[PDB]
Amino acid sequence: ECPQDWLSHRDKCFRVSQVSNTWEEGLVDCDGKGATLMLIQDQEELRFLLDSIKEKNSFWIGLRYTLMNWKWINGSTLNSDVLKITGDTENDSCAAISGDKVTFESCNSDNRWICQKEL
Amino acid sequence: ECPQDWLSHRDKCFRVSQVSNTWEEGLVDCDGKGATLMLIQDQEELRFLLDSIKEKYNSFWIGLRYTLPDMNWKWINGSTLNSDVLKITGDTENDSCAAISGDKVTFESCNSDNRWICQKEL
């Protein structure tokens, strides 16, 4: 059995954050619960979760990497004001669940997150 | 002195729900936590929570509800809703429930799926 107030599914306990915040704040929140950011095991896991949650925000998952001449489809370069909010100082890219898909965005965006524990 | 994982503000504690579900499910969820669905003292209190949650477009059930009589539902053109549409219109309880949505309180059918805020008084 899982701890109180954690969703159960197969071998895993899940917890969904109360608040929205950076990818890093979600990861440090999870560690503090002795958990980690959700690592999607399969389509069935994800849909189950989303069925229980019924959200209509994104959720940060345990995926991050570090990314370039950015151009629009017409050939013109992205000006800096746009670069500002397409990305961040660190030029990292952090993954979130937004419905049944995995989107990628600046780690400084505010989303909710899911923490997981292996029972 | 607020329980762990409750948000602290003046002499109140708040907890936002992990999940979205009916107004009644939130009512009962909070009761099981020794709390009630949020009762708003003032706008400051509403803004604190929003600035905490950082989700100013979602809807949050609070502790306010009314019911209606059973209604003869017509379209704006004056014609009657046929039974096949009435089967998926509104809810059994003919109720409407209050929800925070940004700096406002709107009413929505009580069978919608929204997150909720429970409050305890600290």
From Swiss-Prot, chain A:
<keyword id="KW-0430">Lectin</keyword>
<feature type="topological domain" description="Extracellular">
    <location>
        <begin position="1"/>
        <end position="119"/>
    </location>
</feature>
<comment type="subunit">
    <text>Homodimer; disulfide-linked. Interacts with tyrosine kinase LCK.</text>
</comment>
<keyword id="KW-1133">Transmembrane helix</keyword>
<keyword id="KW-0735">Signal-anchor</keyword>
<keyword id="KW-0675">Receptor</keyword>
<protein>
    <recommendedName>
        <fullName>Killer cell lectin-like receptor subfamily B member 1A</fullName>
    </recommendedName>
</protein>
<dbReference type="GO" id="GO:0005886">
    <property type="term" value="C:plasma membrane"/>
</dbReference>
<keyword id="KW-1015">Disulfide bond</keyword>
<feature type="disulfide bond">
    <location>
        <begin position="94"/>
        <end position="107"/>
    </location>
</feature>
<feature type="disulfide bond">
    <location>
        <begin position="30"/>
        <end position="115"/>
    </location>
</feature>
<feature type="domain" description="C-type lectin">
    <location>
        <begin position="1"/>
        <end position="117"/>
    </location>
</feature>
<keyword id="KW-0812">Transmembrane</keyword>
<keyword id="KW-0472">Membrane</keyword>
<comment type="function">
    <text>Plays a stimulatory role on natural killer (NK) cell cytotoxicity.</text>
</comment>
<feature type="disulfide bond">
    <location>
        <begin position="2"/>
        <end position="13"/>
    </location>
</feature>
<dbReference type="GO" id="GO:0030246">
    <property type="term" value="F:carbohydrate binding"/>
</dbReference>
Curated annotation (Swiss-Prot), chain B:
<keyword id="KW-0430">Lectin</keyword>
<keyword id="KW-0472">Membrane</keyword>
<protein>
    <recommendedName>
        <fullName>Killer cell lectin-like receptor subfamily B member 1A</fullName>
    </recommendedName>
</protein>
<comment type="function">
    <text>Plays a stimulatory role on natural killer (NK) cell cytotoxicity.</text>
</comment>
<keyword id="KW-1133">Transmembrane helix</keyword>
<keyword id="KW-0812">Transmembrane</keyword>
<keyword id="KW-0675">Receptor</keyword>
<comment type="subunit">
    <text>Homodimer; disulfide-linked. Interacts with tyrosine kinase LCK.</text>
</comment>
<feature type="disulfide bond">
    <location>
        <begin position="30"/>
        <end position="118"/>
    </location>
</feature>
<keyword id="KW-0735">Signal-anchor</keyword>
<feature type="domain" description="C-type lectin">
    <location>
        <begin position="1"/>
        <end position="120"/>
    </location>
</feature>
<dbReference type="GO" id="GO:0005886">
    <property type="term" value="C:plasma membrane"/>
</dbReference>
<feature type="disulfide bond">
    <location>
        <begin position="97"/>
        <end position="110"/>
    </location>
</feature>
<dbReference type="GO" id="GO:0030246">
    <property type="term" value="F:carbohydrate binding"/>
</dbReference>
<keyword id="KW-1015">Disulfide bond</keyword>
<feature type="topological domain" description="Extracellular">
    <location>
        <begin position="1"/>
        <end position="122"/>
    </location>
</feature>
<feature type="disulfide bond">
    <location>
        <begin position="2"/>
        <end position="13"/>
    </location>
</feature>
